[PDB]
Chains A and B, each alone.
Chain A
Amino acid sequence: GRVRTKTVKKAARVIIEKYYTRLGNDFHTNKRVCEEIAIIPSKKLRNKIAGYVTHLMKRIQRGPVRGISIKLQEEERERRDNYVPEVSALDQEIIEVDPDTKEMLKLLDFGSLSNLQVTQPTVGMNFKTPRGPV
C-alpha cells in the first residue's frame, strides 16, 4: 500500500533535476523547500512528494541514477574526456602474429618494414564446441 503514484514520482524528479543545489537528506527541510518552490495543491501530496525526494537523496549519492542534474553530468567528463593516458595501449613494438598472417602483410609489402615476431599456432583445430545436449 506504500507504492507511490505516477504524479508523485514525476513531479519529484523535476525537483531534483532542477533544485539539487538546495536539498539534502533531511525530510523536514526538503518538506519546507518543496512547499516554497513548487505549487502543491494540498498537504498530503506535499509531504508524499518530499518523501520520494529524500529517498532519491541516498539513491543519487551512490551512483549514476536517472539523474541528468549537472554534477552527475559533469563528472563523467573526467572519465570519457580525461584519461588520455601518458602511456599507449597501442605502442609496444613487440607484438605477436601467426605464420599465415605473416603471409598476409607480405603481399601488403610490409614484411620487411616491420619487426613483428610470429607465434606458431596449435595444430589441434579443436574449434567448434560440442554439438547436442551433452
Chain B
Amino acid sequence: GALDVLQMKEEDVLKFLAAGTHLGGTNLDFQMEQYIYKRKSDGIYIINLKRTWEKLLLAARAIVAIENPADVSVISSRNTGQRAVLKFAAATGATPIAGRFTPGTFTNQIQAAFREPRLLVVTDPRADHQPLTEASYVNLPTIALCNTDSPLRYVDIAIPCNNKGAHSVGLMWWMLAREVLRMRGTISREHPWEVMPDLYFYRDPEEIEKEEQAAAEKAVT
C-alpha cells in the first residue's frame, strides 16, 4: 500500500512485537534473503516488518478481487492455526478446511468433498504442502504465511511473518482478517476493530474451564 491511509499505524508494532512475528528460526531459505533484516547473536533471523506489512496488504488485494466471498478456500493442517482458520472463514465469509486435507479434493471430481476454489491461503508451506502441489494441477494461485524455514514452491504472495508459535499465527490471521474487511465497507479505518486478537489464538490444554470457574465465584454465585 503506497498510500498514507494504508501506512504502518504504529499501534500494530505493539501487537507484532508482543506476539513474536519477527523471529525467523535458525536458517533462512534463499528466496527470503529479501524479507529479512539481519541475523541476531542468537542465530535467529529477525524480519523487516516493513516487508511483512507490504505483503500482508498485497494478499488481501487479491482476496477482495475475488468476487464471491465464499470462494477462497482457507486451509490449515497443524493445530496451532486450526482455531484461527475457522473464525477467519466466519469473519470474511470464506470456506474453511481444518484438520486433515483429503487428497483428491481439488482434482477428483467424483466425490462430494470436491472444492473448486479460485484462490487459497495456507498456514504453513512445508507442513501443509498437499493442497499446494494439488493446486498445481487446477491452476490456483496460493498465499502462504511463511517463515525462513519454509520453501516457496507454488506460493505466490507468501507472507514472511511467522508460522511457528501460537500467538504469531492467530494474529496474522487476525491482521489479515481485519484488513480484508477494511478494504470494504465494514470498517472505516478510524474506529479500531473490536474483535480481540486473543480470540484467534491456539487453545490451551485441559485446565481451560478450571481456571475460569476458579475466578468466577462472584459472577455466577
Are A and B in direct contact (Cβ within 8 Å)?
yes
Q: Are B203 and A121 in contact (CB under 8 A)?
A: no
Chain A residues with Cβ below 8 Å from B195 are 84
Name the distance in Å between B170's Cβ and chain A's nearest Cβ: 10
Q: Are B50 and A108 in contact (CB under 8 A)?
A: yes
Q: Which residues of B1-22 have CB atoms within 8 Å of chain A's CB atoms?
A: 8, 10, 13-15, 17-19, 22
A89 to B40, CA, bound (A): 25
Q: Are A90 and B198 in contact (CB under 8 A)?
A: yes
> How many pairs, one residue from A and one from B, have CB atoms within 8 Å of each other in the complex?
85
Among A93, A114, A127, the residue within 8 A (CB) of B13 is A114
Name the distance in Å between B118's Cβ and chain A's nearest Cβ: 27
Does B32 sit at the interface, judged by CB under 8 A?
Answer: no
* Chain A, residue nearest B49 (CB): A108
Q: Interface size class for chain A?
A: 20 to 34
Among A84, A97, A122, A128, the residue within 8 A (CB) of B199 is A84
Among A88, A97, A113, A114, the residue within 8 A (CB) of B196 is A88
A98 to B201, CA, bound (A): 25
Does A105 sit at the interface, judged by CB under 8 A?
Answer: yes
Does A95 sit at the interface, judged by CB under 8 A?
Answer: yes
Q: Interface size class for chain B?
A: 35 or more
Q: Are A125 and B41 in contact (CB under 8 A)?
A: yes
Binary A-proximity of B82-100 (CB < 8 A = 1, otherwise 0): 0100110000000000000
Does B38 sit at the interface, judged by CB under 8 A?
Answer: yes
Does A101 sit at the interface, judged by CB under 8 A?
Answer: yes
Among B37, B41, B48, the residue within 8 A (CB) of A123 is B41
Does B43 sit at the interface, judged by CB under 8 A?
Answer: yes
Q: Are B42 and A91 in contact (CB under 8 A)?
A: no
Name the distance in Å between A27's Cβ and chain B's nearest Cβ: 31
Chain A residues with Cβ below 8 Å from B17 are 95, 97, 116
Chain B residues with Cβ below 8 Å from A84 are 195-196, 198-199
Does B46 sit at the interface, judged by CB under 8 A?
Answer: yes
A91 to B37, CA, bound (A): 25
Does A104 sit at the interface, judged by CB under 8 A?
Answer: yes
Q: Are A90 and B203 in contact (CB under 8 A)?
A: no
Known contacts A80-B87, A114-B14; is-contact A104 B46 (Cβ 8 Å): yes
Chain A residues with Cβ below 8 Å from B86 are 80
* Chain A, residue nearest B53 (CB): A108
Q: Which residues of B85-117 have CB atoms within 8 Å of chain A's CB atoms?
A: 86-87
Q: Are B41 and A101 in contact (CB under 8 A)?
A: no
Q: Are A91 and B13 in contact (CB under 8 A)?
A: no
Q: Are B40 and A100 in contact (CB under 8 A)?
A: yes
Name the distance in Å between B191's Cβ and chain A's nearest Cβ: 17
A41 to B42, CA, bound (A): 69
Write 18 A-B pairs (CB below 8 A) sorted by A numbering. Answer: A79-B208, A80-B83, A80-B87, A89-B18, A89-B19, A89-B197, A89-B198, A89-B201, A90-B197, A90-B198, A92-B18, A95-B18, A98-B46, A108-B8, A114-B13, A121-B41, A125-B41, A125-B43
- B: which residues have CB within 8 A of A? 8, 10, 13-15, 17-19, 22, 26, 37-38, 40-44, 46, 48-50, 83, 86-87, 167, 171, 195-199, 201, 203, 208, 212
Q: 13 new A-B pairs (CB below 8 Å) besides A89-B19, A91-B18?
A: A80-B83, A83-B199, A85-B196, A89-B201, A93-B14, A95-B14, A98-B40, A100-B38, A100-B41, A105-B13, A122-B42, A125-B41, A127-B26
